[PDB]
Design an enzyme around this catalytic site. Structure first.
Site: not given
Ligand SMILES: OC[C@H]1O[C@@H](O)[C@@H](O)[C@@H](O)[C@@H]1O
Ligand SMILES: OC[C@H]1O[C@@H](O)[C@@H](O)[C@@H](O)[C@@H]1O
Ligand SMILES: *[C@H]1O[C@H](CO)[C@@H](O)[C@H](O)[C@@H]1O
Ligand SMILES: *[C@H]1O[C@H](CO)[C@@H](O)[C@H](O)[C@@H]1O
Lengths: 225, 236
Positions: B44, B93, B186, B188-189
């Site tokens: 995402h 995701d 910020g 995320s991932g």
């Protein structure tokens, strides 16, 4: 194995076939007897199937057809993959298998000497993997010359060994992984390399890569206690 | 990271910052080095800018200010978003990034081990999230990498906590009942990691929620071990 001739029985008594046999068996990888209850092979062989109880190990054979219900197999008591091994790369491609019941050696099943630092000549490779590309019922043989790594580069660490004609035509392919690269010196056979990877199955100028057993001796001795 | 504290240099050497040059170059996501040419992140992260050529990847840094336009960045050769991922939706995701150029491992730039399918019964007791995300719900991206420790919350109780969405087996929930310690915008991932044995493992990837530390609403993380086959398949 590809580029090479068929196997005499007893010629390579240390060679084993690792098989999984979930409901029925299948030869996935090779390996080397190095101790009564120890087999050395490649870490990456267990990427898809890290489940130890599912594996079955056969030594002292030549034709895989010989394996039947009444064929004694060995079991994995403990699978020791190097802790730095990572599925995305070919580094640290090495694994110890501790067998559940220690073997009793014969004419056809015996260990290899670990390397104790030289320039090897007469180095050989074996396995039950196809030539070119399916699975062969009878173990195979080919002779190969070591390629200095620094030349091998065409990242290749001090922990790797390379072998192959750069004319090409003899190398190992799937099902030969974890099988042995051996050399015949000071009158004695030694286990110098473990087949790990190379692009394709060597064609023309693509030497195969091998884990370098001598640089993992501390590890191996540490893990055998 | 809400409820965190500064990381040290070399503490989390798999953590990378994913940036894009829109106006000034800007940090948008985190990610985890998993090999010399492989980075694992959230899919995402590319929802709004699904153009690989645009992204810059930076590792081995603590402060985003260290990044000048003369420091070398890695680029995306290949962006592999999971086949089944859909944009607004929260499942699958996950994304693999194949870097244009092999990284050089150093003291401050190392890959992190992935879990084995044979590790999937492991109960992890020592887990950490890190990132440059907001430290409060409405806030600013942080200059200094944050770290926070946070406990795993089992599936079923996490589902209980989220009445509207479906928390499947592919996810993994972390947080305190009181809230207050979480990943924020910020992060995320980025990695959720756990020490087991003497070894750090990548157990999750920061995903949805970004309630940013609300009461009884654990951050939700992509469960990495669930994707080993996928990873093995895509990294050959
Ligand atoms: O002193 C440790 C450092 O940690 C970080 C911030 O807390 C800085 O203000 C501080 O200098
Ligand atoms: O500074 C760039 C450096 O990256 C790293 C190594 O690949 C070095 O050979 C190279 O010089
Ligand atoms: C080894 O022997 C087999 C017999 O099945 C032949 O196919 C071939 O000669 C190989 O070298
Ligand atoms: C010698 O070891 C073999 C290993 O297969 C066993 O069959 C038996 O225990 C014997 O003592």
């Amino acid at each position: 194995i590809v580029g090479g001739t068929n196997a005499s029985l007893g010629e390579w008594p240390w060679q084993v076939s690792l098989q999984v046999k979930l409901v029925s068996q299948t030869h996935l990888c090779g390996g080397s007897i190095i101790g009564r209850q120890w087999v050395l092979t490649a870490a990456h062989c267990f990427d898809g199937i890290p489940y130890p109880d599912v594996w079955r190990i056969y030594g002292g054979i030549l034709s895989l057809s010989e394996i039947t219900k009444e064929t004694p197999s060995s079991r994995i008591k403990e699978l020791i993959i190097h802790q730095e091994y990572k599925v995305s790369e070919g580094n640290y491609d090495i694994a110890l298998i501790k067998l559940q019941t220690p073997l009793n050696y014969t004419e056809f099943q015996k260990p290899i000497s670990l390397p104790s630092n030289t320039i090897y000549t007469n180095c050989w490779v074996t396995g039950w993997g196809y030539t070119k590309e399916e699975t062969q019922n009878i173990l195979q043989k080919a002779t190969i010359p070591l390629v200095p790594n620094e030349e091998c580069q065409k990242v290749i660490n001090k922990q790797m060994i390379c072998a192959g004609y750069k004319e090409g035509g003899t190398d190992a392919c799937k099902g030969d992984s974890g099988g042995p690269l051996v050399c015949k010196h000071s009158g004695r056979w030694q286990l110098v390399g473990i087949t790990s990877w190379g692009e394709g199955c060597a064609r023309k100028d693509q030497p195969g890569v091998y884990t370098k057993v001598s640089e993992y001796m501390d590890w191996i001795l540490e893990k055998t206690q």
